[model samples]
Target: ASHSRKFLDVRSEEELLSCIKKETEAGKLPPNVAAGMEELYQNYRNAVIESGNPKADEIVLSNMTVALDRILLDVEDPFVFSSHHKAIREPFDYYIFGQNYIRPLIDFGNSFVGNLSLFKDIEEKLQQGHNVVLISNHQTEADPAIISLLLEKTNPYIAENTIFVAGDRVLADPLCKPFSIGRNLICVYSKKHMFDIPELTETKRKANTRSLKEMALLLRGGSQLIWIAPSGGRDRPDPSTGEWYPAPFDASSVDNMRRLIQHSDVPGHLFPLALLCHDIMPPPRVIAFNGAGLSVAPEISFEEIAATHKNPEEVREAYSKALFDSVAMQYNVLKTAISGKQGLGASTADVSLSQPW
Candidate 1:
């Protein structure tokens, strides 16, 4: 072999670790980020081995090298996001790199989509130059990439153009930035972390306010496919019951999107979304390399969305509840399908299969 220090040229995990150590020492990478990367790799390798893969060491080392290649290069090197504007479509296929890195963890033959007709309606709506909004329950950090991968075969348009409303960590963490750069995100500080730093709350608020303005402007532009988790943060264990659940939809967050979408005087539709891929790339909970399932419910027109009259707060309460219930139902449907050891086959549930190439 020719002499080159490319990470892929390295054959062993120890060799990969040595590269990170040297890179950090040379100030090419932060020691803190590099160390965290190494720790995450350990979790990944353990999950890969634990899953009973035949060539665990070979696969794990290759993934490490690829991820390291991503971490070392600047996102700009991909020639993405040329404009300074937020909410723009990705000008490049930057997501391909991110997807290939994640594909090894998904068993697609087992994953399924629900309300196939309605999901297609949303895709068709976006194709018609109408805007659509997905109010989802955040699951794992890989939700964005996972969603795109699920839709890659059938709804490539929606998959490629979706603009994720992301909060903290995704963009800031060096470990995540490589993938993050491939996404079209409206970066804002979330309510969940508002008080963590105390001093930065107002600044964060100002930044979010700025994001809202950009969002409003984009909505007016039309054909925008936006994904926002009104729950603000990824669902965590219920402190009271110690059960895993999606954080309840925030009335305020839901209400803001409701107003913003309509007030922009743009044609937009809202759909509830559910994700059941926690086992895929959940290790950094011991990823099981299982299938990742997602589904979309019928769009809620403002006519029904604005129902439950009386005061503004009461209206939002009713609005949020309906959206959350739909997502919950869909999430349960996917969970039941998977838990029963039934492939996300439509035959297992009342919903029909949803893949049209």
Candidate 2:
């Protein structure tokens, strides 16, 4: 039902661009759409060059048509521009198409994933009509795709089933939408940006509450795998050290999800996941033509944390802290593993422990 996601073939940008031109000539794409695609193509070319990928234009050349058509789908159908509240499901396996589309850009030789068995446990739990939640740190616009790419071989089902508690920023961006549309999302207006507009505070809160309510129903539906990055938003490097780290999670955000999953009356499992692909997407200084990675740490039991701390007020922060500590620590392991590739040229041979494909 889908074309090959094998985007490895070399194609002519000069030729596919003519395909875009023909579309415009046939009035299939509006003037602005075609123009934007051209501009993006140039940007993509630059990024490939900047990433130091030897086959810069070849990847862009092969990907342009697929990337262009997806955006055109967003333009023609406008599915990504949902008004609010409702859950956004992938129309099809655009998620698959998407992972392979970006797959070429990733340098798996330097990339690493840890605790493969942990993911298998979650996959089993989900298939048993239970729900699994990944409490993670947000990194880049393409975090979801990076995750899916990592799991494509080992855990495609879970990757396909993982629903994201997403924010409004990505959905509203034209470039991000093509990728965002391929995901299962419960879009909320982040508290971080809630006050950005000032006047929409009340409206944003209501919209967020509505999405949470929808999420409750989803857990009850069972076999739902959800990922929520409760860090308010993406993590940034410390202004002083200029080093990236996982953002500290919001306690109230964690507590609400804790309470929500508890009340779902479904078997809910929460795990601390650390994502380190900031280098791959927006390493900020520039993209990494190579090296993207992640690691999942042990799960936190509601009762384990609950028993250790009885005071509801104090426990809210404690529960989040417990998970945060786990993520922050594992992030170090990932960073150390890739430090070699980051430039010192030290081999990860010295970086200790499990790395499964």
Candidate 3:
């Protein structure tokens, strides 16, 4: 005997909604659609609870409150999420919040897994009025994303106050446009812009100076943080020479830092950061080091730096080395905790070397 099976059809509104939720969570429905459905569900749940079943409404509100608290405050308690850890809170908050549409792709590709850790501490530092500067070792397309997610998760308040000086290609990405500008991230054109054409080199320099001054004002007004990759875009490991050198560090990082130091009227210090990683994962393996802060005093005498390096190229190199060395010293102290090493050293390479072909 052969028997045919009939599928059960959801007819009522409640039944249809239940079916939708089930299908959405199962990946059969698109993420935005699922989120919309969940939002509707929450609204219904709220109505139902308000209609006399107060216990249910209490539960929903409680969950929402806990989630918000976790993001804003409770997450600062070290080992709060751990079973047997002590209460030693790390110095940064890193998180990713927004549309969950990419979660499946990220999960399938096994990316973004271990790349978020600094969101909370970073957020806290910003709240405490720290002028944070993220100096990262540029590797792949994921570097900026990792940093963005970190800021989104941990220090969302700082997002408005943050600025990223990105490469031209990054500004080209469709996904990148919203984050770059939507979050109030200002763009700094590294190369000469179209308007600079026909203008003398000095005129071009003047234009760039004005653009950067605007960025500096935003940074000071909002106590904003800036993320700069001194390596420009790539860090090549030279195993033969036992030196991991980033292609000649760009002048932009040092130039921006110098500009900030010269212009800031209030007490301002630069925090050196290193993104150390176990491996580059789809999610990329990394540990961000929020090294000690270096203060820029009004008394800093840089006549010696200017005297030694007369040429434009020499000035760029000199400033770049100063920025790297400033951060390197702090990383050396925290090496044991972040890298599980007692000692580390900055690479001894000529900072002014032309990019190798």
Write model 3 residue lDDT over 1-357, tens digit each, in one string. Answer: 221111134433455456556654655546654454455345434443443433544443433322222221211221111111111222322222211211111211111111123434555666776565655444444444444433344344543344555544334432222222222334444452434555555654564566567766755664566766666554555659843333455667656676675566544445444433222321222212121111111112245667788797787677666656644443333333323322223212211101010
* Over 4 Å off, model 1: 1-8, 49-59, 74-93, 239-242, 282-286, 305-308, 344-350, 353-357
TM-score of each: 0.86, 0.82, 0.43
Steric clash count of candidate 2 = 0
In model 3, which range of ten residues has the least summed lDDT?
Answer: 348-357
The most accurate candidate by TM-score is 1
Report, for every candidate in turn, its global Cα lDDT versus the true structure. Answer: 0.73, 0.73, 0.40
- Residue 27's lDDT in candidate 1: 71
Summarize candidate 1's per-residue lDDT along 1-357 as a digit string, tens digits. Answer: 222345666788888888878777867666677777788688778767765667777778887787777666642233232111243235434477677667667666667777766767887787777788899998788888899888888777777778899867776665777787777888777898999999999988888887878888788888888899988877766679955556799888988887877787767888889887776655233455776678887755546655647776676788888889888877877776665565545343435545333
lDDT tens string, model 2, 1-357? 333222223257766677668767867678877887787777666666766677776677766667876676665566543432233444656666677667766767677776667888888888788888899998887888888887777887766767887877578755567777777788888888899988889988887777777788888888778888999788899999988999899999998887877888888878898888886667342444557666787777657777888698777888999999888877777777776444223224322234345
What local lDDT score does residue 54 receive in model 2, on the 0 to 100 scale? 75
Give me the displacement of residue 248 in model 3, in angstroms: 3.7
Clash numbers, per candidate? 0, 0, 17
Candidate 1 similarity to native, TM-score: 0.86
lDDT of 2 at 51: 66
The whole-model C-alpha lDDT of candidate 2 against the native structure comes to: 0.73
Q: What stretches of model 2 exceed 4 Å from their correct place?
A: 1-39, 46-56, 80-93, 283-286, 340-357
